[PDB]
Amino acid sequence: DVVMTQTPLTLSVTIGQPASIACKSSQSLLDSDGKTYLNWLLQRPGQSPKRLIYLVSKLDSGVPDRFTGSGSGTDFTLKISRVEAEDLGVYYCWQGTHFPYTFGGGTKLEIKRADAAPTVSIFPPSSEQLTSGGASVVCFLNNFYPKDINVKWKIDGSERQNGVLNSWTDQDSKDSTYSMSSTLTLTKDEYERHNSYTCEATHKTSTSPIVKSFNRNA
Amino acid sequence: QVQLQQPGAELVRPGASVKLSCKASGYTFTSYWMNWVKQRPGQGLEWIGLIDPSDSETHYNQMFKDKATLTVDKSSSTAYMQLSSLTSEDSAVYYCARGGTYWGQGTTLTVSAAKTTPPSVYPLAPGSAAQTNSMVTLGCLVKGYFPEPVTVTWNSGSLSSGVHTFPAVLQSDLYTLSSSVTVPSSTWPSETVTCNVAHPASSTKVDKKIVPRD
Amino acid sequence: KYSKIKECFDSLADDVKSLVEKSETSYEECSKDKNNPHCGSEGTRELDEGLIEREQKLSDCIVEKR
């Protein structure tokens, strides 16, 4: 099979800056019919791939001319004249000349941007969940940069670790930030044993945690 | 309006087989070769094979020779891929793609003995009574469902900015995720916000209005 | 008195341009990827169909005054 090798594996680019990705095949992609079926795809997280370039250098439908494809034979390059926030995701080369068709391993494009402090929000279990006997307390730590953060739960002033699950989003295609949810899950009777629920975010933008809380009575 | 329609999800048990579909419209079905592509969680794309719908001629990646069978039904403009003797390795998103430009949304195949379960959807309303800043954050907790995926939108898709849907966490054979939306304080609760949750495996949709707390 | 059938020819050129555009789009789509050798032929067939249809529409419009 034709081995497709992309470099680099990851690209960090400032918005407005150019970007270049290379694809090398282990065999020439020039077909006996005279055509070279080298494709470039982009796949934003949680979405189907879309095609940016077909036949080495031809822009496909909807694709802006910031994208340029070049090369021949076994060496190919995709250039972005100036990177925009929406360009993030994974780029794949894909050869459709020889069977079986084969893909490169992908090059991840991350956006580089200014630091940002998270927006923190806490939510008591809804009464509907409580009727079922469960209690999830939810904390959103939204739209921060860079991609690291700490979260701490306190119940009536005491640190709580057990029962916490965190989930991170991929980089945002609009503002290039990240978000993380933190969820504390216990039973209704365990939840109702306490009054004050607090979640604290610590991020590099401040030595001071951002603290949000509620009291089960107020 | 070239469209390729694939079901969101299939759940089938180890050892069994599954028949994935891709229904095409907006063009002449018989004119274009149809590809099938596999993608495991957090991994790259793998080509399975292709079929010529006009004459059912096929080309396969030999890695899938004993796993995939491609067929078409011209009476319904549908391309099918049958996967046999399923194992955990077969759990993946599978795309049909008409050439390279037109892609289906993908079917998430889950190979498990676990049971299909629809989610409970709980509203997350500002648990602070009853004042706010210039902006307000609302949410939906989508809990206890199986298998993936679920889709979440806000106000039937008309609320698209300031939305974060977090990846589900799997625990005890059930998934849980949340979605947050942020809107100007001058629009809620004065106008309605509802989260719409779709769970294709159970064919369920829940449309939950966020109402201010007690 | 002015021509009442002259109007029948009003949209004719733009309609033909649309049909030909469509055929050229389909030929382009065929060339993006390997496909059955008859892929291009089927777009040609659809074009011929649309042209005969537009010509028949023109004949119908003319008779409608004459």
Q: Do the beta carbons of residue B120 and residue B103 sit within 8 Å?
A: no
Q: Find the helix packing angle between C12-31 and C39-63, rounded to 10°.
A: 170
Hey, what are A46's tokens?
């949680």
Structural element, H or E, at residue C43: helix C39-63
Question: Which residue in B28, B31, B51 has the most chain C C-beta atoms within 10 A of its own C-beta, making it the best mutation to test that interface?
Answer: B31
Please list, in sequence order, all residues whose beta carbon lies within 8 angstroms of the beta carbon of residue A32, skipping any fewer than 6 positions away: none
- Please check whether residue A178 touches B, CB under 8 A: no
Q: Which residue of A has its CA nearest to C31?
A: A55
- Please check whether residue A214 touches B, CB under 8 A: yes
Q: Do the beta carbons of residue A124 and residue A24 sit within 8 Å?
A: no
Question: Which residue in A149, A181, A216 has the most chain B C-beta atoms within 10 A of its own C-beta, making it the best mutation to test that interface?
Answer: A181
- Please check whether residue C34 touches A, CB under 8 A: yes
- The residue type at A194: H
- Please check whether residue C49 touches B, CB under 8 A: no
- CATH number for the segment(s) B114-212: 2.60.40.10
DSSP structural state of residue C20: H
Number of A:B CB contacts under 8 A? 125
| Method for this entry | X-ray
- The residue type at A57: S
Hey, what are A100's tokens?
């079986």
Reported CATH class of domain B1-113? mainly beta
Q: What is the DSSP string of B10-48?
A: EEE-TT--EEEEEEEESS-GGGS-EEEEEE-TT---EEE
Cβ of A106 within 8 Å of Cβ of B168? The answer is no
- CATH number for the segment(s) C1-66: 6.10.140.1890
Cβ of C32 within 8 Å of Cβ of B101? The answer is yes
Q: Which residue of A has its CA nearest to B94?
A: A48
Shortest Cα–Cα distance, A124 to chain B (Å) = 6
Sheet with strand A4-7: strands edge to edge: A4-7, A19-25, A75-80, A67-72
* Residues of chain C found within 8 Å of residue A54, distances taken between Cβ atoms: 32-33
Q: Do the beta carbons of residue A101 and residue A88 sit within 8 Å?
A: no
Q: Do the beta carbons of residue A124 and residue A188 sit within 8 Å?
A: no
Considering the segment(s) A114-218 as one domain, its CATH architecture is: Sandwich (2.60)
Q: Which residue of C has its CA nearest to A59?
A: C32
Cβ of B178 within 8 Å of Cβ of A138? The answer is yes
Looking from the CA of A209 toward its CB, the CA atoms found within 13 Å total 13
Phi, psi of B142 (to 5 degrees): -105, 105
- Please check whether residue B164 touches A, CB under 8 A: yes
Beta bridge partners of A39: A94
Interface of A with C in 23-42 (CB under 8 A): 35, 37
Resolution in angstroms, to 1 decimal, for this deposition? 1.8
Q: Which residues of C3-32 are buried (b: 16+ CB within 10 A; e: fewer)?
A: eeeeebeeeeeebeeebeeebeebeebbbb
Hey, what are A217's tokens?
């009575």
Question: What size, in residues, is chain C?
Answer: 66
Shortest Cα–Cα distance, A160 to chain B (Å) = 20
Rounded distance, CA B27 to CA B46, Å?
Answer: 26
Rounded distance, CA A197 to CA B164, Å?
Answer: 23
- Please check whether residue B45 touches A, CB under 8 A: yes
Rounded distance, CA B10 to CA A73, Å?
Answer: 41
Minimal CA–CA distance to B157: which of B142, B174, B179?
B179
Candidate from A58, A60, A96 with C-beta closest to C34: A96
* Residues of chain A found within 8 Å of residue C31, distances taken between Cβ atoms: 35, 55
- The residue type at A188: K
Minimal CA–CA distance to B124: which of B110, B146, B143, B108?
B143
Coil, strand or helix at B207 = strand
Q: What is the DSSP string of A185-214?
A: EEEHHHHTT--EEEEEEE-TT-SSPEEEEE
Rounded distance, CA B51 to CA B40, Å?
Answer: 22
Distance between first and last Cα of chain B = 47
Cβ of A54 within 8 Å of Cβ of C34? The answer is no
Beta bridge partners of A4: A25
Please give the C-alpha separations between residue C37 and each of A55, B53, C33, in angstroms, as whole numbers: 17, 13, 11
Rounded distance, CA B175 to CA B167, Å?
Answer: 9
- Please check whether residue A123 touches C, CB under 8 A: no
* Residues of chain B found within 8 Å of residue C30, distances taken between Cβ atoms: 31-32
Rounded distance, CA B17 to CA B39, Å?
Answer: 18
Same-fold call for A1-113 versus A114-218: yes
Question: What size, in residues, is chain B?
Answer: 214
Minimal CA–CA distance to A90: which of A151, A149, A154, A171?
A171
- CATH number for the segment(s) A1-113: 2.60.40.10
Q: Do the beta carbons of residue C30 and residue C44 sit within 8 Å?
A: no
Rg of chain C over all Cα atoms, to the nearest angstrom: 16
Interface of A with B in 122-161 (CB under 8 A): 122-126, 128-129, 132, 134, 136, 138, 140, 142
DSSP structural state of residue C28: H
Rounded distance, CA B5 to CA B80, Å?
Answer: 12
Minimal CA–CA distance to A93: which of A30, A4, A9, A18?
A4
Parallel/antiparallel/unpaired status of strands B34-39 and B163-165? unpaired
User: E strands, chain A, where?
Assistant: 4-7, 10-14, 19-25, 38-43, 50-54, 58-59, 67-72, 75-80, 89-95, 102-103, 107-112, 119-123, 134-144, 150-155, 158-160, 164-168, 178-187, 196-202, 210-215
Q: Which residue of C has its CA nearest to B56?
A: C36
The alpha carbon dihedral of C29, C30, C34, C39 has a sign of positive
Question: Which residue in C24, C33, C35 has the most chain A C-beta atoms within 10 A of its own C-beta, making it the best mutation to test that interface?
Answer: C33
Note if the bond before A146 is cis, omega within 30 degrees: yes
Parallel/antiparallel/unpaired status of strands A67-72 and A75-80? antiparallel
Coil, strand or helix at C44 = helix
Beta bridge partners of B135: B184
Residue C2 CB coordination number (10 Å): 5
Cβ of C39 within 8 Å of Cβ of B101? The answer is no
Burial class of residue A113, CB neighbours in 10 A (0-12, 13-18, 19+): middle
Candidate from B31, B55, B100 with C-beta closest to C39: B31
